[PDB]
Design a protein around this ligand. Structure first.
Ligand SMILES: *[C@@H](C)[C@H]1/C(=C/c2[nH]c(/C=C3N=C(/C=C4\NC(=O)C(CC)=C4C)C(C)=C\3CCC(=O)O)c(CCC(=O)O)c2C)NC(=O)[C@@H]1C
Ligand SMILES: *[C@H](C)[C@H]1/C(=C/c2[nH]c(/C=C3N=C(/C=C4\NC(=O)C(CC)=C4C)C(C)=C\3CCC(=O)O)c(CCC(=O)O)c2C)NC(=O)[C@@H]1C
Lengths: 319, 317
């Protein structure tokens, strides 16, 4: 009755963050069946309009960019290699396109790229993964035996990789209440280390979605949300909660503003079936954007952290 | 010794899969170019490309200013590769940058133009595969150099797609041994074969300490000459170039052994010495993009750390 009122509205994810724009394409036609209201301003310059229900993507993007998104329409979810660098046809404006699939639909998140970054996209993708891979080797070379030193290491490595003001390891107890068991902040900041938080601060609906979306980013909790519009011929709502752009629930948004955490990056810590052990939670006291390549690299660092956590659990229950 | 080093340094030949420019460390103008650079970068007064060419006339403006930026950064701060576009064609290359005394050296490796959208994605996937391989090396139980080496050649085989991958160990007398090997089915195994120290001379062994990954696309390809301004106050070395051509003796050696292509990773243990090489061979030509060779560099460093540990745990017990 509480899980199903939150879950219905998050799963539809009809409100996005304005740092990016969203398209949904029909797998058969390759045409637009849903768009964020900012997508026309972001992807075109202001018949048809340039961008609505039925728009062909050969009108929006340069020919190699349109052809790579058309080819993505033929791949299993698991075989998608993100992100795709696309260019808009008129402006030459660049974006990272992040693709995911929901049955016959292909959902694209567009995150702008500074045009001076275009030449360095492979270079910066490699550097982000290298730095994460080095963090992985420091986690592996720790002596076994201490959940505390493993979590301290992780928040130190994530703090240096992501540049956020605060990074904590947030553990879920048996009763679903949480505890901050590791923490590093910049010098001004109030410490949360060792505090315990009620289960209802993180409802089951968010818990469920972190099993599937392993990295969630909120750029600015005070940003004006943007509405996604869908094809009126669809007799159900599209599921958009897989979007990197999904807006926080208004209650979480206020919770963030309350706590002076304007921005956040959260990585799911899933142990082997599967359990959500906890979250790696990064906060910023001002707005913050990190590009897809670095959030991708963080996914893998978080999966390796999950493996080491689960081994420290097995070495608790032995000894 | 100094006869091999003169010819692999000063030789001035590159492999034709790419082209080379050297730019003066202050003017940022061309002081050396491979003879294929004009056709490959311009679609062949002044010509479009010679000694003195300004890079602003060869590449689009964002491409030229990403190179101008590298000109002001220490070798240690260089993030490779830069994606560049040629000015009229829009033809794209990976530009791999390294510094010598007077100069910035750029290796240009072609990118299929319809693959430009997938460059970041392909780079992340190459590193992710290598990162997964790293976690499989670390989760091995200690005690077995054989299991350590078998794993490495299996991970390198699945990452690079070559016909054959071997771990080649240097003995105390510098002769080599194939101690691990994975091939595609139907190939003769070279596992356990011992080869003389002269098959890999000191010269090559020295240079693998500095250049950790070396690719030869086709041992039969026609080498292309690098031309420099004869007034340049030093000789350009190409030892650091990804494009450097193999000595004609190695190229014959490869053809004899039915390895038309190779990819070799130095295994350096701690002072430092060259423990061995991870050697990939192919029966036909093979090109692998820079991101994948870069990710193999890190995988090979990590393998070297675990090799070194199995050595210390042998000395113990
Ligand atoms: C309002 C009705 C109730 C509520 C709702 C709510 N919470 C979330 C999600 C999250 N809540 C937290 C909580 C914390 N962040 C912290 O830093 C700390 C201190 C350590 C806590 C306790 C977190 C991390 C999340 C995940 C949010 C993310 O995506 O980064 C949601 C889901 C929001 C969404 O749309 O994702 C909701 C609806 N929270 C309350 O406190 C009220 C009781
Ligand atoms: C010619 C007069 C002599 C010679 C010279 C030579 N060898 C190399 C470099 C390499 N040689 C090997 C040898 C092997 N490759 C194999 O697959 C095997 C079987 C396991 C062996 C023993 C290798 C791996 C290299 C590295 C080549 C590379 O750079 O990828 C060189 C250097 C070539 C260059 O220009 O870099 C030279 C000059 N080889 C002979 O057999 C003659 C005695």
């Amino acid at each position: 009755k509480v899980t199903t009122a939150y879950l219905h509205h998050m799963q539809k994810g009809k409100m996005i963050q304005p740092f990016g724009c969203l398209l949904a394409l029909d797998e058969k036609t390759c045409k637009v069946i849903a768009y964020s209201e900012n997508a026309p301003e972001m992807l075109t310059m202001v018949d048809h309009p340039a961008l609505g229900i039925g728009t062909d993507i050969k009108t929006l993007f340069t020919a190699p960019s349109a052809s790579a998104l058309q080819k993505a329409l033929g791949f299993a979810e698991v075989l998608l290699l993100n992100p795709v660098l696309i260019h808009c046809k008129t402006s030459g404006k660049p974006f990272y396109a992040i693709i995911h699939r929901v049955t016959g639909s292909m959902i694209i998140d567009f995150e702008p790229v500074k045009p001076y970054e275009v030449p360095m996209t492979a270079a910066g993708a490699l550097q982000s993964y290298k730095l994460a891979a080095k963090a992985i080797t420091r986690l592996q070379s720790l002596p076994s035996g201490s959940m505390e030193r493993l979590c301290d290491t992780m928040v130190q490595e994530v703090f240096e990789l992501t540049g956020y003001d605060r990074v904590m390891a947030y553990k879920f107890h048996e009763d679903d209440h949480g505890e901050v068991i590791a923490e590093i902040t910049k010098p001004g900041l109030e410490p949360y280390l060792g505090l315990h938080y009620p289960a209802t601060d993180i409802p089951q609906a968010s818990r469920f979605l972190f099993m599937k979306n392993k990295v969630r980013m909120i750029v600015d909790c005070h940003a004006k949300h943007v509405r996604v519009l869908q094809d009126e011929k669809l007799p159900f709502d599209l599921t958009l909660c897989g979007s990197t752009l999904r807006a926080p629930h208004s209650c979480h948004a206020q919770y963030m503003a309350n706590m002076d955490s304007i921005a956040s990056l959260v990585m799911a810590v899933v142990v082997n079936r599967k359990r959500l052990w906890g979250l790696v939670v990064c906060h910023n006291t001002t707005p913050r954007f990190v590009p897809f390549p670095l959030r991708y690299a963080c996914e893998f660092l978080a999966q390796v952290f999950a493996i080491h956590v689960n081994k420290e659990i097995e070495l608790h229950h032995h000894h």
